[PDB]
Design a protein around this ligand. Structure first.
Ligand SMILES: C[N+]1(C)[C@@H]2C[C@@H](OC(=O)C(O)(c3cccs3)c3cccs3)C[C@H]1[C@@H]1O[C@@H]12
Length: 429
């Protein structure tokens, strides 16, 4: 009992670390405009969940464990639980909101990336806490009054309707296993597709955007972002090819959605072209994200056949000789047709940076995700297990899993700072 008490305070240490880390997140974000963004906004929400959970749950938990008994009675037990599950819930749903956000950033450039603000983010988050609360709290508090009696004996506290290992299983899957799988899906997708954002802003600048058919600087009929319709001067040809392309009668006009989807089609085709080609591929392998994106610009413009006839240049681009590549490109007919765009692309080649386009080059999601899964799944697996054998799990293991579920909330700020040097230097001060 003496050694037990001596070790008990460790938990307190962890709770303190949690509350200060989170409190730091909050303050640092509020006091530094740099840190204000949509993504950082969601990260603020998370740090909040972790704070409310670290100043309340971790502690009263430490208490309950220490005493071996529940002192504060029924209602304290109810509020503690409700705050706890509503909170951690809002934490999972917050993670989801994040993943889906970055996803809609990659896949829906015009519809999503373009209109997204910290206001919209705020709304989404608030709505999330709403959902969480409305799922857990009413159940946890009002289950007794509903059923008419209180299953819970005084002295030991837990959620009334969760007695059964099955309903607990199903609710863990729904509330954990499902959302985790989905976060993994969205994740690996984002991790595969991250560059489409940069290459998007790139082609966006170079080409520009128009919803209704307009004449190119060359005069050719062209629609959307960088989508060429036809070089024939007859408007009918263009409009018709376009219609083929959309699968509707466009009447010369298209929606922003249709547009973003067209772009995506185009880029995927560009890339697929670079990888199908014997020339562009190997070179394209040795290129860093910037330059590579440049290559995808040229290919997105002239086509694979087109960009493959640059062999004089390709040679040096693969050999990491830049100034010579650029020099080799300036002398071609490409540069002659539309010098500005090409000049931007080439500069992008030489420098290896987006500064020509003034462009800002997935982050932290790995960390947060990993922490979450690895501090939760022990417990969820322990539940899945308890479903099938009654006595195989002693209360100890439950408590431990719980603690992990906390050290998530502890570790999340840590992952914040460790991932972004911004949060580092902001905390230091
Ligand atoms: C440590 N917790 C506070 C407790 C145990 C863990 O719980 C979870 O991981 C669960 O999947 C479930 C646990 C038990 C039945 S369903 C969730 C609960 C609430 C939203 S998702 C994590 C959090 C959560 O509040 C519970």
């Amino acid at each position: 009992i003496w050694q037990v008490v001596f070790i008990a305070f460790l938990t307190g240490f962890l709770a303190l670390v949690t509350i200060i880390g989170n409190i730091l997140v909050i303050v640092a974000f509020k006091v530094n405009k740099q840190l204000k963004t949509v993504n950082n906004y969601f990260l603020l929400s998370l740090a909040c969940a972790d704070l409310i959970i670290g100043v309340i749950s971790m502690n009263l938990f430490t208490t309950y464990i220490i005493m071996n008994r529940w002192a504060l009675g029924n209602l304290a037990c109810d509020l503690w639980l409700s705050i706890d599950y509503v909170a951690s819930n809002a934490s999972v749903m917050n993670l989801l909101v994040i993943s889906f956000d970055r996803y809609f950033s990659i896949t829906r450039p015009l519809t999503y990336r373009a209109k997204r603000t910290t206001k919209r983010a705020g709304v989404m988050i608030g709505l999330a806490w709403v959902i969480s609360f409305v799922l857990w709290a009413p159940a946890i508090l009002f289950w007794q009054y509903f059923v008419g009696k209180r299953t819970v004996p005084p002295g030991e506290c837990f959620i009334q309707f969760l007695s059964e290992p099955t309903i607990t299983f199903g609710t863990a899957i729904a509330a954990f296993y499902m959302p985790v799988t989905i976060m993994t899906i969205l994740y690996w997708r984002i991790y595969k597709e991250t560059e489409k954002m940069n290459i998007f802003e790139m082609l966006r600048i170079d080409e520009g955007l128009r919803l209704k058919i307009y004449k190119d600087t060359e005069g050719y009929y062209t629609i959307g972002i960088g989508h060429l319709l036809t070089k024939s001067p007859s408007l009918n040809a263009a409009k018709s090819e376009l219609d083929k392309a959309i699968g509707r009668n466009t009447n010369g006009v298209i929606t922003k959605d249709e547009a973003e989807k067209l772009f995506n089609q185009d880029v995927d085709a560009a890339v697929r072209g670079i990888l199908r080609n014997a020339k562009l591929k190997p070179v394209y392998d040795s290129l860093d994200a910037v330059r590579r994106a440049a290559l995808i610009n040229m290919v997105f413009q002239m086509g694979e056949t087109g960009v493959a006839g640059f062999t004089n240049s390709l040679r040096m681009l693969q050999q990491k000789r830049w100034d010579e590549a650029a020099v080799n490109l300036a002398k071609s007919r490409w540069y002659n047709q539309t010098p500005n765009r090409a000049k931007r692309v080439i500069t992008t080649f030489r420098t290896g940076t987006w500064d020509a386009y003034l462009i800002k080059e997935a982050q932290t999601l790995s960390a947060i995700l990993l922490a979450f899964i690895i501090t939760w799944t022990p417990y969820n697996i322990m539940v899945l297990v308890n479903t099938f054998c009654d006595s195989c799990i002693p209360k100890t293991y439950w408590n431990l899993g719980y603690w992990l579920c906390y050290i998530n909330s502890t570790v999340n700020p840590v992952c914040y700072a460790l991932c972004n040097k911004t949060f580092r230097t902001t905390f230091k001060t």
